[PDB]
Amino acid sequence: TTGERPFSDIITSVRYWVIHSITIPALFIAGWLFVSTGLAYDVFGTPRPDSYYAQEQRSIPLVTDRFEAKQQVETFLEQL
Amino acid sequence: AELTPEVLTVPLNSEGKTITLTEKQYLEGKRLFQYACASCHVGGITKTNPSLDLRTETLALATPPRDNIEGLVDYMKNPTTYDGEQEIAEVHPSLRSADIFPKMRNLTEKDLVAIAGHILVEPKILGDKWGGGKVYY
Amino acid sequence: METITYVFIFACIIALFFFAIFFREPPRIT
Amino acid sequence: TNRDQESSGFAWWAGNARLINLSGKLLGAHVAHAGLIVFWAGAMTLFELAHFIPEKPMYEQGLILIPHIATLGWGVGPGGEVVDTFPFFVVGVVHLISSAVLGFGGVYHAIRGPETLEEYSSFFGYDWKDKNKMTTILGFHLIVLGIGALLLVAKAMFFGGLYDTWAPGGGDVRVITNPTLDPRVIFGYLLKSPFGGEGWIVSVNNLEDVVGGHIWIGLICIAGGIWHILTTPFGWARRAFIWSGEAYLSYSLGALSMMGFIATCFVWFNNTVYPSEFYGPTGPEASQAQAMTFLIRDQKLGANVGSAQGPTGLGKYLMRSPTGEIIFGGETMRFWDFRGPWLEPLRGPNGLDLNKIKNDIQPWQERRAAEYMTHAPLGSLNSVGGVATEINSVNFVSPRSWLATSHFVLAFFFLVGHLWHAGRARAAAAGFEKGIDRESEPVLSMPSLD
Amino acid sequence: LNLWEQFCSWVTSTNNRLYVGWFGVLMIPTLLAATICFVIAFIAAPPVDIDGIREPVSGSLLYGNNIITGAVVPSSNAIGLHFYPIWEAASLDEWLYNGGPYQLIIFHFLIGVFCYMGREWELSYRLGMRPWICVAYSAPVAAATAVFLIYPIGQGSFSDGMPLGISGTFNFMLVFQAEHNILMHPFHQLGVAGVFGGALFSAMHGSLVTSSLIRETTETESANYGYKFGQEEETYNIVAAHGYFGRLIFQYASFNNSRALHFFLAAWPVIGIWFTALGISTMAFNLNGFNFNHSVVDAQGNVINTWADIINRANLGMEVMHERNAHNFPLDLA
Amino acid sequence: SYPIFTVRWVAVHTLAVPTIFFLGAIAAMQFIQR
Amino acid sequence: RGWFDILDDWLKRDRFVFVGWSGILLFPCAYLALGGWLTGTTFVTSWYTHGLASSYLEGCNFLTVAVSTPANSMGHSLLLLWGPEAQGDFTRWCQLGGLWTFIALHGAFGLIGFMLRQFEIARLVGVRPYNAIAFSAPIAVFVSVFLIYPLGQSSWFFAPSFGVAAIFRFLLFFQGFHNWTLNPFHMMGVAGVLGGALLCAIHGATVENTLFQDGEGASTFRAFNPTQAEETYSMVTANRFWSQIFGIAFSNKRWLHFFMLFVPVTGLWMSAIGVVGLALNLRSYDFISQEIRAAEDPEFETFYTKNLLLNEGIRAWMAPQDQPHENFVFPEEVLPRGNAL
Ligand code: CLA
Ligand code: CLA
Ligand code: CLA
Ligand code: CLA
Ligand code: CLA
Ligand code: CLA
Ligand SMILES: CC1=C(/C=C/C(C)=C/C=C/C(C)=C/C=C/C=C(C)/C=C/C=C(C)/C=C/C2=C(C)CCCC2(C)C)C(C)(C)CCC1
Ligand SMILES: CC1=C(/C=C/C(C)=C/C=C/C(C)=C/C=C/C=C(C)/C=C/C=C(C)/C=C/C2=C(C)CCCC2(C)C)C(C)(C)CCC1
Ligand SMILES: CC1=C(/C=C/C(C)=C/C=C/C(C)=C/C=C/C=C(C)/C=C/C=C(C)/C=C/C2=C(C)CCCC2(C)C)C(C)(C)CCC1
Ligand code: OEX
Ligand SMILES: [Cl-]
Ligand SMILES: [Cl-]
Ligand SMILES: [Fe+2]
């Protein structure tokens, strides 16, 4: 009873669905492409399936230095 | 890390000849191993006889040598004890005992080669974990 | 000494149950 | 009509209670529901058959219905080998076709036919409070159930037999020619303790007793049905029960709950009417098979398994039960009541026989023990076979675990449902199921407690 | 009336200080037997060979336990599921060594609480109440039945029933996790939602009613004196409470119907406990928690561990250490 | 009649807009092979 | 008049989602804590901090994803995005575990904002602020477990990671290393949680089964009006029932509902005190008299000594992978194991 339009009115109106038949799929497809282009890996630094290890070393690239931790992940990543 | 032709290259016979398995063969071998073998040999151990495992070093010291494709394919046809002295088809699945181990009835020669390739490739991926048991889980 | 202590506390609780049930303040409608 | 809360008194989430006194629509609901059960039996069978690989064990393939058909002797031969899948196909198709008929009748009575039956037919109409009509319909259904029990008998004795895991020489389909008729045996099962080494009716261990039991149950049900068609409840029964639709529902809920817990134990322990060839080994069976497996292995290596003292002082392989019988050692000491066709050749009057163990273990026994040890009914909810610490590799949960867990869950909720409806039927017959009358609150007329 | 009817009238009387009833006729002797045996055993029983390997575990106070370590110890694994009453033993000394007290106690206790449940139905009927408090109590009963009866049956031994003691309870939980990964089972997760949520909703409901008590007292009086037992008027303003809670979240997330609210308070913890009891009762048949051990694999085939694999390492530590002298063969199959 | 951009409108979309983007991302992930 | 009072007007408008002055703190912090968790569990690894995959992107499911703690070498660094570790590099920040402190700290300030919301709304509506007071127990738990415990330990690494399986690991860690089940402060927590769930169930069931018949429907929910003066159920009948069933019963509805707050709130507060002790390894790990007896008498065995053997298994089998910064190599001959297993 706070003055906003009732949700049941909104989601049963054709105008709502005219808008959201476009905006909901566009968002879904944008999320899909964020993964399918591989962009998600590079934004967040998440290893691709071939990038957890190098071929010979089977040790975890664990960060062991607090203040040069950033540069240390850089070294671990150049080792791939 | 990647499943490369070098990883997929394994001894074919006891004379030093190698064979390079395809990625399809390797995946076929893993599937067939799970189908017919993993109930006892999950992870390269042997649940009903933990003294014998599927590590390459163990297979190499078996009689006849089992650390190559021909040796493993022969084992799946006519399995023996570790010293080669007894034939154990009556208690171990084999083509010779497909009547009493019915899952062996549809394994082709090509299937046995894939299973053998899986057994030889897997320790090249997993190291001591293959045949290691729960200590390595 | 420890066993006596544990059983003593337990016995006091059982006694407390008895008084709390049978010698409660009676509920009264007003 | 009455299909709203205002007219019926029941909200939509209790909407099926609107059917209590609408015999025509309620008949539709029941017939349609029977169609759902029959539909599932048919469709699930065809699905199982479509997924079925005849050279893997049934229990490696997530099958629960094909094992039921095979136990009746259809489609299988010696050792449980599948020789012909067409009976599985027939059972599946005929159930699926039949469910269309039941669904048709259910939909017809539910939305098209007469809503109440009493104005249309005094035979099919009924009042829940009419005790004689209630015992008459009960009696019809007792006769139907008794005929069903005799169909099992006819299968076992005249139409090919049943699968007998105990058949001499190895499990096989066998015609039962001498079913057990002696009531001392048949009803003796009913008086056995349900505890260990006894197991109540779950202990039935041969098909002659199974078949003879169904001969008795068949005749009992037909005779009881005739009795209830011709009689009306006695005075002591009239005074003891609540006579209402919801009360009768509550009685059946309690009964089905009891039956559900019984079936749970049946599939968990019994390997006669649930052959391990089709359902996998029981929990007790696989644990015994592990001890057997390593007894065989270590004895082949030279161990004297009778004199081998384990770390605790008990025999590592063999020890005594609390009454002296020779049994397998280790944790499986708890499972010494287990009996199975691969193990019994080693058992003599005093228990496991050391001379038979040393000299007479056959390769087929070693094979079976190895198979059952490695198909123990342990596995994860996502069907990773093995102990909880197992790595992914083997896709396996035993049919015995699926069937025991499902029916414990169902039996449990049906007991809750019994309590719900029994309590409600009592309150409704006494007139306070909707709450306390403010002007006639019973406790206000009682003396205070103190 | 005749003497039998006089007895029935006393048994079913609404005026006994404690209701007896027909369920109470079974409940009273069985709970008394279980209680008396438990107290005596907890204080004075000698050690019990729980795992059947002649390695007796001390549970009683007089044999070196405190309240936290003490227990009545489950009966011997050599007994399994066999029924072991006093008269099956050659002597009380044998009965005690093999864990006879545990069976006597749990069987009388379980009968007692099933009858306690029926008795809750029975009194509600004598008082003209609606009947379903006993359905709420069926949840704790199901949970007790799961750990004292169903789990032993599934595993083949009362030696795997939950011990009657504080540290023995923890032992049961740790071994259960090792053998079933119960933490990864959705029915135990529902149990946690049930009791966390039940505690949350108890605190929520308590605080909302307390927040809106109508002023009937001065500041030197407990507000509790503003309610008189049996008064007809409600003692708090539910419109005020709903006006608060509906603004805390949003209007339609808050109950304005006290009957709906109290049904929700009953149903949430009861259903959660039903499911967690069913968790124990179905892991009793070894349908275990989710197994994602080695589920994540890289391009070459190396396992990439997840938190599930770290859980697995903890489970392994418990698996290999528990009952350290009891296993002779490589698999723990029950 | 009714306003269309409200505090409620903002709160709804701060949650709903990323939720749909994330669901599209996670759907795509179901087709990734090692 | 006055911009402050004008702003106060707008903040306190009766709207679908109430805002308030507290909303300025609550909404950004709550949104960022939740958004950070969804972001991390969907896209972010734990490979560089833990050697673990932890996101849907890597193949985890809802039970195994987490936002994991930073590496032990980070100590108790705030790990600000602009701080000396990440130096403004968003990608490196995620790889270093910056989302863990992001979520923990925005979560902490969001909980503050939420309890301020409870105060603010109670004051506007005219009710006593017991709901806020009860919420002090969630706050005590959050602060003791996610902030004080790791602050007492070597680093944030040993705080709980934000995930379902990650939390299960935390439980088993506390068993094996702290013997936390033995701790009487945890035991009081358990009593308050299970006791609260009990009170929730029994009170809801009692009200629903002592209802007055206030309508004709067999479904009884419609026979209530929020504005009615009368109790909807009979306290007198409820009191007699429980008096005769259990021996005692509530007679005072105000005490009853206070007790429903008291029990779970007090239990959570007690569990928080025990966790503050565990921050310092100040455990209830042992009973000394038990250990002296068991050391001298190899036939003496209790469930207490049995559980310590389980703990020793947990530590030896879990530490090498659970504490990778220690570079533990335990040759298999040193691993504690019973027979066969
Ligand atoms: C033969 C079995 C049987 C029959 C004929 C009835 C019949 C009835 N019940 Mg009873 N009941 C039963 C068993 C049965 N019940 C059991 C086993 C329980 C324990 C749970 C109950 C608990 C119960 C309660 C608490 C109530 C009833 C009520 C009723 C009446 C209305 C029911 C209704 O409209 O539901 C409509 C159906 C629904 C609202 C859907 C329920 C969905 C369930 C809970 C979940 C199912 C999930 C599924 C199994 C798996 C997931 C599928 C999903 C992925 C799609 C009706 C007389 C009502 C009553 O008392 O009337 C007088 C009532 O309040 N029943
Ligand atoms: C097995 C499950 C089951 C069955 C057999 C029934 C059966 C029935 N319900 Mg119940 N109900 C159920 C579950 C079920 N219900 C559940 C889960 C809920 C909670 C959502 C309810 C809530 C409920 C309420 C609130 C009411 C009923 C009512 C009824 C009766 C009248 C229905 C009607 O008028 O339809 C009208 C609907 C239609 C005409 C649409 C089509 C319906 C048909 C049957 C679908 C058939 C599809 C099928 C694939 C066709 C096969 C054809 C082929 C064989 C040739 C009917 C006997 C009503 C009643 O009691 O009346 C007195 C009533 O008021 N039900
Ligand atoms: C007696 C019941 C029962 C049992 C024991 C089985 C057993 C099995 N099924 Mg079958 N099935 C059933 C009924 C049953 N099914 C029904 C009703 C359907 C139609 C949906 C099917 C359709 C089906 C298919 C399509 C397949 C199987 C498969 C399987 C196998 C693997 C099961 C699995 O992975 O589950 C996964 C576990 C779950 C999904 C968990 C379920 C949890 C339930 C929903 C909780 C229920 C609680 C309760 C009922 C609700 C109470 C509410 C309360 C508030 C009152 C296993 C042998 C598979 C197979 O191997 O075929 C060869 C397979 O592909 N089943
Ligand atoms: C068992 C459940 C059941 C019951 C009690 C009824 C009862 C009734 N039906 Mg319904 N009906 C059912 C199921 C049932 N039907 C099914 C499955 C279908 C789909 C075929 C129908 C389709 C249907 C229609 C179209 C009509 C009825 C009508 C009637 C009414 C008159 C019946 C009559 O005079 O037959 C006389 C008796 C006989 C002809 C002798 C019995 C012949 C049967 C088929 C022999 C089989 C017996 C054997 C035991 C069945 C085993 C089945 C099992 C394996 C599942 C009566 C109330 C009529 C009605 O409502 O009138 C207003 C009506 O028009 N029914
Ligand atoms: C669906 C099956 C079914 C149902 C629901 C009924 C229902 C009824 N029968 Mg009928 N009956 C049936 C099948 C059935 N009968 C069969 C198959 C036969 C042939 C054997 C009979 C022969 C029969 C006779 C001779 C009589 C009845 C009577 C009755 C009425 C009273 C029953 C009663 O008080 O039981 C409750 C049982 C008791 C009060 C006895 C004591 C039960 C003890 C205390 C507990 C037993 C539980 C125990 C744990 C069970 C498991 C272990 C056990 C197997 C060892 C009731 C209408 C009576 C009647 O009024 O007829 C008109 C009556 O005199 N029936
Ligand atoms: C009220 C909302 C709120 C609050 C309480 C926080 C709180 C926090 N944020 Mg978050 N954040 C917010 C909203 C909020 N944030 C929003 C809306 C965004 C999106 C833009 C972010 C994006 C964000 C990121 C990306 C990060 C944080 C981080 C942090 C943490 C470190 C912040 C810091 O050091 O600031 C320091 C700055 C202040 C405290 C401002 C104070 C201004 C002073 C009072 C004015 C001084 C004037 C002086 C008195 C005048 C004297 C005049 C005189 C001489 C005449 C802290 C927990 C960091 C973190 O969590 O790392 C783990 C981090 O990396 N926030
Ligand atoms: C009443 C009601 C209801 C219910 C209903 C029902 C339950 C119904 C049922 C129904 C049914 C129950 C149906 C069924 C049907 C069936 C069918 C329709 C079938 C057909 C079949 C076929 C066609 C087959 C084919 C084939 C063959 C022959 C061979 C092999 C292959 C195949 C499979 C292809 C509801 C809930 C909705 C609600 C409302 C009311
Ligand atoms: C088939 C078979 C068989 C047989 C079987 C039989 C022969 C059975 C019978 C059965 C029977 C013959 C059963 C019975 C039952 C009974 C019951 C179940 C009862 C119940 C009761 C009740 C429920 C009651 C209640 C009450 C009371 C208690 C008091 C109050 C009132 C009243 C009435 C309510 C054998 C095993 C050989 C083998 C396998 C197969
Ligand atoms: C961190 C960060 C940030 C932020 C971010 C955010 C704010 C985000 C958000 C995000 C979001 C906001 C997301 C969302 C998502 C969602 C999702 C992903 C969902 C899902 C769901 C589902 C899946 C469902 C399920 C279910 C349930 C739950 C129950 C019912 C049934 C079902 C099954 C349906 C910033 C930039 C400031 C800075 C840097 C850092
Ligand atoms: O006993 Mn008590 O715990 Ca059931 O698993 Mn087997 O058994 Mn013994 O090990 Mn693990
Ligand atoms: Cl242990
Ligand atoms: Cl063992
Ligand atoms: Fe209340």
Numbering used by the authors:
A (entry chain E): 4 to 83
B (entry chain V): 1 to 137
C (entry chain T): 1 to 30
D (entry chain C): 24 to 473
E (entry chain A): 11 to 344
F (entry chain F): 12 to 45
G (entry chain D): 12 to 352
The study reports:
Three psbA genes (psbA1, psbA2, and psbA3) encoding the D1 subunit of photosystem II (PSII) are present in the thermophilic cyanobacterium Thermosynechococcus elongatus and are expressed differently in response to changes in the growth environment. To clarify the functional differences of the D1 protein expressed from these psbA genes, PSII dimers from two strains, each expressing only one psbA gene (psbA2 or psbA3), were crystallized, and we analyzed their structures at resolutions comparable to previously studied PsbA1-PSII.
On the other hand, 19 out of the 21 amino acid changes were observed in PsbA3-PSII, and the peripheral region was partially obscured, which hampered identification of two residues. The hydrogen bond distance between D1-E130 and the 131-keto group of PheoD1 in both PsbA2 and PsbA3 strains was shorter than that between D1-Q130 and PheoD1 in PsbA1 by 0.16 to 0.17 Å. This indicates an enhanced hydrogen bond between D1-130 and the 13-keto group of PheoD1, which would cause a stabilization of PheoD1 and hence an increase in its redox potential. Furthermore, the B-factor of D1-Ser264 decreased to 51.8 Å2 for PsbA3 compared to 59.8 Å2 for PsbA1 and 60.1 Å2 for PsbA2.
